[PDB]
Amino acid sequence: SLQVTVRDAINQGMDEELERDEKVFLLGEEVAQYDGAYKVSRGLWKKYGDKRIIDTPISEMGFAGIAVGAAMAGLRPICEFMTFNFSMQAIDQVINSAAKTYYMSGGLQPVPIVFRGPNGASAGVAAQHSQCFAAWYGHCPGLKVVSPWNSEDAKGLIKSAIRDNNPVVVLENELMYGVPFEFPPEAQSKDFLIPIGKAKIERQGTHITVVSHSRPVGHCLEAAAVLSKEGVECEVINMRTIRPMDMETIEASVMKTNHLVTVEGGWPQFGVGAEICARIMEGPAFNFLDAPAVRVTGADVPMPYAKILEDNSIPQVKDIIFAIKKTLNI
């Protein structure tokens, strides 16, 4: 076992897929000689060169469309947005040119492409650099949307994303880049894959099901550890995939715990938690709920700059515990 950060785990994933398939290449801003805007692609340009690691100008709509074009022509690009806030300039290419193309062609033109980059809140980057796009991209047919949390999640999903013959959006997290995790030998392998569409239970529990994705999954584990000292066993579930989400794992947990709380970083209205709550109500686990499911989300505001204000615009550990204790009437 090794100590591997999520940033190093993504670097391992992309490196192994570049070495495996010469049709795979990476393009984006500062991905080459700068070693990555967040050092995620460090050393890749020194290993593969201008042909496979392509520094692009600040022209989001332009190089995203260029990536999709190369994907239609038979290549397997990795298109990095510096943050996904900047993907809104290219979101027409993601949705209309990439996601919908295979369906419109009647099964003739596939688009094997990956859109990766950090997503959601950071630290002091204010309103225009803190938006979470999990619900937006998960809303669209023809896409696959994933949101890794730890190092295992990051490497396994980035490798599945590249090998999938369809557009995959990889919503990363900047604050998770530098966090180390125990990396078991199974994750160090070049054949390590995490299938898209299956969630992982990070903690077994019996009193309440807590579902989350990306960085707040760690806060759920912190909350569950505090509540465990009080006799409350939380079952924390890591979505991993946003579309198509693994509701069967959530439903099976709710049928055991009889309680559900969703935790997400993005905005509340029409967000990820809203879909999970609608699905349990339409689904077979609704009769097993002994209390309504509640959503823990970010504040319904543009992200403020000040440290004290941003801290209260993001789900905190005490916010998860408070919602959990409300659900259990304790």
Added chain:
Amino acid sequence: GSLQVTVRDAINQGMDEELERDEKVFLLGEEVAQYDGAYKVSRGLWKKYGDKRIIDTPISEMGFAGIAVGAAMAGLRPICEFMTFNFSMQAIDQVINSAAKTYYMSGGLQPVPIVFRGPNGASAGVAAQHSQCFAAWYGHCPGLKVVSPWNSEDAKGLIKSAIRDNNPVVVLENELMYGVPFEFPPEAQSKDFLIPIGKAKIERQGTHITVVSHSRPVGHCLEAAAVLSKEGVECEVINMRTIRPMDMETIEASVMKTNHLVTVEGGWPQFGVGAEICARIMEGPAFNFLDAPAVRVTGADVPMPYAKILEDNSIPQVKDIIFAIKKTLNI
């Protein structure tokens, strides 16, 4: 003294009356001037107000949308039309990052009075890239206000409120509703007719089930309610009108009487409008009043196909609403 007025004419009345009221109001977009409007919504406006107020733009969505937002920052009150809202994705950064978030980031110093209007959602044979509904996307974002009119009253009252609001307002219209006539009462014909943003309207009183919808499917809900009424099932059809901030008190008050809830929408199911209504009803005071789980009627989970038989089955039909209602009521 009522008149037969199409939704297209009601929007045209709204914009015309607000242009005459405030010289800071102007309309820009593709084909809005000499072509009389891509869907004839802005007919006659250029002949009345001229090049200064009705501005034909090139096909440069990100560019002229940003120009509108810029003009709004300098004190004007633009009306930015997208020919359809599929094409707004090229300009969506200006709506979200430049317009919605600015007043908050400025600390309350720089308001952005702007309106984004145009048809939204499915049409007839326009395929996948021309049929997307953006109600959930724009409703997801703070600093915006999102409305979705249905009939002629909705269109004129909301378009006038959108122009008078000092903040970015998105008006998601519907092309298939443009040519539909409705009885236009004398109160709506006035130049002072306003429909407040954030309040829903009950289109039909009922006691057995609450049916909430917005835009064109509201008419299908009324058609379903008329069919079920002959069978002894009284539906309470609710027209949201506003997507953000939606009127949950009106839905909650209805569920407390009917004990059943069905949402009907044209857009995609996952992370859509119905998902928020269902999540909010579960978090709210009305959850204990439900005698059955709330179910969602949405569009099919696919890119919009072209063929008539396929497109017809990718959109909520009246029989699909009746089917969901009878499932909820176990009849």
Added chain:
Amino acid sequence: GSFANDATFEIKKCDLHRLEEGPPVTTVLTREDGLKYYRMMQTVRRMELKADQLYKQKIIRGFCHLCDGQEACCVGLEAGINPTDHLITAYRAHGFTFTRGLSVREILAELTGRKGGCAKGKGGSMHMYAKNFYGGNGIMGAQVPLGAGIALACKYNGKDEVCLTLYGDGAANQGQIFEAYNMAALWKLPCIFICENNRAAASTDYYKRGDFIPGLRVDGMDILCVREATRFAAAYCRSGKGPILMELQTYRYHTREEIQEVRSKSDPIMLLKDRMVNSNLASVEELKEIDVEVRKEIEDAAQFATADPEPPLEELGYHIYSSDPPFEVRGANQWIKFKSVS
């Protein structure tokens, strides 16, 4: 009663931008190529006229943009490139779908939204795809970066293939086109940017809009003039000199709007007709025999497109993802489940 095998023709001189020498002003047209180009143009013409008829009869729904009057472009460009080269355009792709190899039966059946269509009735007029034909695209300007990426793959694979990336003059102010100019020149992509000008913009010299990219303005009603410019531009990209911009000046047929003064003087089929008869490459009787065969083939295809049934409802969810296992997609309510197969 004697037919010349070939004939030399004077072709119009292209206006240049950042180029010292342009395409030749003379070209050789053989009898076989003339008859081939003529049959191809007359097929595209009768196909668009039939589509216009079905559109008026409301058998075709939604959009139906016709390219009649521009037959020298889609046929002229095909004569100057290889089948192993790549091409992409916007929403007016009926002619290019036929010139890139698809049959008139497939194109019309797709227009009528039937199971026999090239896209199985899923795409309609704007989304038809073929081998090395990356289709029409409904979002204006979006196909320009897509084509630049196809050119990137051409350079990536190093088989000396080029990509033709077309856009109309109405799309020439899309910002993403200028982003594609800068990247294509920066990486020397074998991309031929083609602006289809139909005769809004502060500069109407579209062949100069690439600034650093050289351009040439071509008469798009002369098929031989288009063929020679395409051969020139394709050879330019194959030499590794990077991208090139090409403006095709054409006119669309779809009182003051008399404008028979374009059909009478500049019709591309009539120009190739007059050139071949005066140079003894073919007879007037020969070209009338071709018109009859083409008209019969279109009516036979239109009959197929009219009688062919709609796609089955069971295939509504098919082909959402490629190379994926089967799954179910949600319909109008949670009790409607469509099976989705790759």
Added chain:
Amino acid sequence: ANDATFEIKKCDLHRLEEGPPVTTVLTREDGLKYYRMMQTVRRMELKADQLYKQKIIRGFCHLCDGQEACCVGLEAGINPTDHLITAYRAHGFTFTRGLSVREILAELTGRKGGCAKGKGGSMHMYAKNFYGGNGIMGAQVPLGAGIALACKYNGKDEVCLTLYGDGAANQGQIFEAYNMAALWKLPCIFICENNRAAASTDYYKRGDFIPGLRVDGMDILCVREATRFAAAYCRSGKGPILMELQTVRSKSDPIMLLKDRMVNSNLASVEELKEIDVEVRKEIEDAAQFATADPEPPLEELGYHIYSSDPPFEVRGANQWIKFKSVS
């Protein structure tokens, strides 16, 4: 000496027959004002750099040190009734457009005394006729064209300066703004801040049909004169214009150039400019301590200022039981 004439570099032209003059007159009063303004911006960015390295400032903090001849030179060529907008490197322009050093630093440190009450940070600071910094690159360029549209709309002969860096010069929306500005003859001055990924580095030519001029951005007198020329061009109704400012310390510091020019021509003494350095340096330390000792904004104001001219309402916090009051 009361005044003195100075030689300024000749601008390279694009679609212009006659350009800005190659000589200009600088008065003693303007020189001392330009020097104090430039020296204040310099000491302010160095102080912010220290606080940024000390992590007192969070997130982004793009500094404009070395570009003091731009924001001060541009202000000397425009009126307070003119309009200006730029990207994320807006600290200098915030001060030249009327905000005090205390407000800028307190906003950088995220305190209630900031100009945006700690809500915006480094990239989103607004002032009178200053439409702020913008975090999305290129997006501010169409915005400036719209502000120029309002200038023409109101018809009081006002202009808008729209700045963008050389790294953003390949944003497609800029070319969309070029085409519409010339089409409608908008009084928009497109300004590309060039320092040292682009097929063409002649940024003053990228407007094609829009005329351009390339200016020495290290000479404050050359920036002022080129700006007056570009402003007069837009006020005459000739439409937009594009202006490239090119912006080592041994013989290119903009403060060192103006300092040497005024002393050699007896416009000021070395002792005067040193006494101004002391006055400016004291003002920076006084503002920095205020920005450090000032408390954070109160949590009760987290939801304030979401909509303008609206009735009060409450917004949802981290969970459905946290409610923040929102006031316009």
